[PDB]
Amino acid sequence: PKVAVRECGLPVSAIESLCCTDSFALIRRQVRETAWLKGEGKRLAVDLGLLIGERGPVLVGLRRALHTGRLPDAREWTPRVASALPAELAARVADWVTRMRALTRARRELPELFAAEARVKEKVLAQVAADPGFRRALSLASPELAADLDRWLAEPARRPKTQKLLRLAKYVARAAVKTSPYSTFTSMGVAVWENGEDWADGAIVRFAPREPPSVILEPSGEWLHGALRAWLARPENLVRSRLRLNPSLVIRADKAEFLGFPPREPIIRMGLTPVVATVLRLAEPAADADGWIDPMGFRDRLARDLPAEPEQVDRLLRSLIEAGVLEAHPLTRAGLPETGEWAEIRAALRHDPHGEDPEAYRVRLARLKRAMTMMWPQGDTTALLHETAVVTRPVASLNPTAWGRGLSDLDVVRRWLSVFDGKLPIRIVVAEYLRARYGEHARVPFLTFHRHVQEEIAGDAPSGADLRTFVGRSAAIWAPPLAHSRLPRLRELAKLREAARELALGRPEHDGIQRVDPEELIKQMATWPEWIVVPRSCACYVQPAPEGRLVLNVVHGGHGRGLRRLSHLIGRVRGEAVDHPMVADEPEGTVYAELSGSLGSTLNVHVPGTRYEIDYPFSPGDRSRDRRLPLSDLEVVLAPETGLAELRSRRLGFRVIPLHLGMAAEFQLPPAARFLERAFGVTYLPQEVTRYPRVEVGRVVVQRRRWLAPAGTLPIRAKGEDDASYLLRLVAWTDANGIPTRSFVRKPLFLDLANPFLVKVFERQIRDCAFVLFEEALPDPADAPPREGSDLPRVIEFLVELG
Ligand SMILES: Nc1ncnc2c1ncn2[C@@H]1O[C@H](COP(=O)(O)O)[C@@H](NC(=O)[C@@H](N)CCC(=O)O)[C@H]1O
């Protein structure tokens, strides 16, 4: 079970140190003492009223004060009144009055204490934000705010505006508690399993001495490919290019059908002249041993098979390239040969930054950005540069006996979550289209199927209705409109989902936890029909929590997706590749094949991890010609076992399972690739305060405890000069509703009520919000796994690949 670890770049002490510990402890005492006094007051009013009617004024007024929570008037609580009561009631009343008086004075003290503590935390914020790793991450993410931080550090007691402080505090929180790839903010490395036995400890994990992260700077894939195509279109770079036939090209005995340039990937049908048709035929023998076509020898080769005239062998070739039938690619791995502008880019990208302070980093990046735009425009490209932080040595060892039950529970969970996959309706609808248009035993060239489906989506007919609903632009009509659908299997799916949900939720809440036994989900699964197929491998992102819990954040496709990028980034930093193991082709008659090349994204560059590959129009791969399945070679058939559409190689017979193993999001995939993944891939991806409990499937936390608060329930700073009195009212409301001190509020906001910065960020974000969802912080930052020496505890997250 292959494992990686993502670690926050700031230690937990970084956000702990921003808490106003003294005044919050007093805010908490006050809130609990106010609630206890008000409760006790009302109970003492009951007992006093009993006493009143046991006799048969003053008492009626004292009663009224206790009931309503105010100090009794001097005339309502006197030695005589205390005399007319039973000693135990008199003493209870006495204690209440004392405590009420103490509470009132402590209410008066609080605002100066809190204000003074909050203000001291301003300098603690700069202390925490001084970290070099953090300033570097911030410098990429937010350069002006980062320069302002650098000035603050150089000029202390140059107290920046509140709004800058809130922005800094938010990034600090991100870097201390959020395990998302955002830039130097977190870093990633591999974990290993270490010899049970050595864990008398009790630890589930043990960390090596902290390796300083190494950083890899990369250009926007979209920038890169726009600039590359620009260069490949210029006449002089034909001799610096190789050519190949577009692997979507299909000659339909008359016309050429193919897919054109990304990102709008038009489906193209064009008329062949007999000369163009012969040009396309002679591309075959003109090809390399690996399919590439030397353009010079091809222009001659054409000169002496057509008539001679080179002047128009060139324009004909040019017209084929501009059209997309023949693809121009550069001569070398990643970038262009060594042309002037490209070797500067490539070197500046590669520049080892060592010893560089954040201001020099900012300067350097701004300069690189310019050279990029004085070459191909940014356009609407958001971010021209990304950075990623990795470590080269294993970061941690894992305790295989303490992990054990958790991984077992996780596998059961991983399988059961298949029923919820947002691609299942797609599969069902696509399969039904196949059956309806072409017949149960039909075998449809993939490209013709893609075109037909796309025609249905663009047009108007009821034959296209389901495709438009589930495969078209839309999440659905309202929610995924199953249950009341024409297709039986969409309705069977809806009931299978409802039964899955009701099995999970049909159980008691004890201490805010509903606990599902994994064997219950195994029992439910043995019942499912064959058209729910469980992926063979999943990347499970989990965070450990107390009592051996794994909190599941995210599942995606496995097969090394994620890990393969990590191996390739480590390989770049070390200067030697990591042999990530290959995907096994199984059962016989089935192969797994990733899409060739990187499909326009730097997040798809990785250890090539499938034997064969789907050879994809403008995204050449790195495989022997015999190991390429061109789009032209794929067909779509209905499988008898599942009744779902599958892919076959016409040339070789195998069932072909398309894989996306790069880290590009599915919407960044060009259209036919997106369709392949969505349709053929085997991965998945009121009126008062309402509490939803946490849901665990033995030790795997599948849903964290939550609290839903409508707009109207949540305290609002009355801008009648409200100040710290606000925190008091907010903490009174949260405590009364069981909302913990630390939570993630809905990208979720980390809220520490003790942190004066995060409370204000919270105040500001939630205005004009219809609902506010609080989620327990689990693991809590305080629960971060311990360390040795001077390495401070950090929040972490594991990528665990389960197979
Ligand atoms: N209830 C809660 N308890 C405790 N930790 C919570 C948490 N909710 C989020 N986290 C953390 O913060 C992160 C979301 O913040 P954001 O990056 O989306 O803005 C989470 N990270 C992830 O889920 C990762 N899979 C990466 C997600 C991605 O790539 O977008 C958590 O680390």
Residue 304 is part of a domain; what is its CATH number?
3.90.930
First vs last C-alpha separation in the chain? 8
Q: Is residue 168 part of a domain?
A: no
Q: How many CB atoms within 10 Å of residue 179?
A: 20
Residue 633 CB–ligand 1 contact under 6 Å:
no
Q: Which amino acid type is present at position 481?
A: P
Most ligand 1 atoms within 8 A of CB, residue of 7, 10, 171, 180 to mutate = 180
Q: How many CB atoms within 10 Å of residue 627?
A: 15
> What residue spans of 702-754 are helical by DSSP H?
725-736
User: Which residue, chain included where needed, has tokens 């100040």?
Assistant: 723
CA of 525 to the centre of ligand 1 (A): 29
CA of 745 to the centre of ligand 1 (A): 11
CA distance 803 to 795: 26
Q: Is residue 157 part of a domain?
A: no
Helix, strand or coil, per DSSP, at residue 612: strand
Residue 553 CB–ligand 1 contact under 6 Å:
yes
CA of 187 to the centre of ligand 1 (A): 15
What SS3 string covers 98-125?
A: HHHHHHHHHHHHHHHHHHHHHHHHHHHH
CA of 541 to the centre of ligand 1 (A): 10
Please state the domain count of the chain.
2
Strand partners, 251: 256
Q: Is residue 122 part of a domain?
A: yes
For the chain, the residue count is 803
φ, ψ of residue 83 to 5 degrees: the values are -60, -40
Indicate the angle between helix axes 59-68 and 21-53, nearest 10 degrees.
150
Tokens linked to 547: 């009592």
Cβ atoms of 689 and 624 within 8 Å: the answer is no
Longest dimension (CA), the chain: 128
Which of these three, 314, 330, 346, is where a domain ends? 330
Residue 285 parent element (H or E)? none
Q: Is residue 545 part of a domain?
A: no
Closest CA to 129 of 146, 117, 113: 146
φ, ψ of residue 743 to 5 degrees: the values are -155, 170
Residue 747 CB–ligand 1 contact under 6 Å:
yes
Residue 121 CB–ligand 1 contact under 6 Å:
no
> What residue spans of 592-646 are helical by DSSP H?
none
> What residue spans of 397-517 are helical by DSSP H?
405-416, 424-438, 446-458, 465-471, 488-505
The data reach a resolution, in angstroms, of 2.1
Tokens linked to 489: 């299997």
Closest CA to 263 of 597, 618, 613: 618
CA distances from 83 to 42, 44, 54, 55 (A): 21, 16, 15, 14
CA of 780 to the centre of ligand 1 (A): 12
**145: Cβ–Cβ under 8 A, 6 or more apart, which residues?**
138, 164, 167, 168, 171
Print the domain residue range for 92.
Answer: 15-129
Burial of 597 (0-12, 13-18, 19+ CB in 10 A): buried
Q: Which amino acid type is present at position 598?
A: S
Q: Is residue 145 part of a domain?
A: no
CA of 727 to the centre of ligand 1 (A): 26
Q: Is residue 398 part of a domain?
A: no
CA distances from 741 to 28, 482, 512, 752, 757 (A): 10, 40, 16, 6, 14
Closest CA to 274 of 249, 254, 259: 254
Helix, strand or coil, per DSSP, at residue 370: helix
CA distance 673 to 89: 78
Cβ atoms of 257 and 272 within 8 Å: the answer is no
Most ligand 1 atoms within 8 A of CB, residue of 7, 170, 171, 178 to mutate = 178
φ, ψ of residue 704 to 5 degrees: the values are -75, 155
Residue 580 CB–ligand 1 contact under 6 Å:
no
Q: Is residue 114 part of a domain?
A: yes
User: Which residue, chain included where needed, has tokens 């009790």?
Assistant: 202
Strand partners, 543: 551
User: Which residue, chain included where needed, has tokens 């209705």?
Assistant: 465
Closest CA to 556 of 502, 603, 612, 623: 603
Residue 689 parent element (H or E)? none
Closest CA to 782 of 729, 740, 749: 740
Q: Which amino acid type is present at position 205?
A: V
Strand partners, 776: 743
Cβ atoms of 658 and 595 within 8 Å: the answer is yes
Residue 541 CB–ligand 1 contact under 6 Å:
yes
Closest CA to 299 of 324, 284, 279: 279
Q: Is residue 287 part of a domain?
A: yes
CA distance 242 to 296: 9
φ, ψ of residue 279 to 5 degrees: the values are -50, -45
Which of these three, 93, 110, 129, is where a domain ends? 129
List the residue whose alpha carbon is closest to atom 24 of ligand 1. 180
Cβ atoms of 118 and 124 within 8 Å: the answer is no
CA distance 227 to 237: 13
CA distance 581 to 593: 14
Helix, strand or coil, per DSSP, at residue 550: strand
Strand partners, 327: 244
CA distance 258 to 250: 6
Residue 351 parent element (H or E)? none
CA of 225 to the centre of ligand 1 (A): 31
CA distance 454 to 220: 29
Closest CA to 657 of 587, 554, 603, 561: 587
List the residue whose alpha carbon is closest to atom 29 of ligand 1. 180
Sheet holding 255-259, edge to edge: 250-251, 255-259, 267-271
Residue 677 CB–ligand 1 contact under 6 Å:
no
CA of 543 to the centre of ligand 1 (A): 10
CA distance 117 to 392: 42
Which of these three, 274, 309, 330, is where a domain ends? 330
> What residue spans of 130-273 are helical by DSSP H?
132-141, 143-154, 162-177, 221-232
CA distances from 191 to 553, 569, 652, 790 (A): 19, 15, 39, 21
Breaks (C-N over 2.5 A) in the chain follow: 56, 685, 746
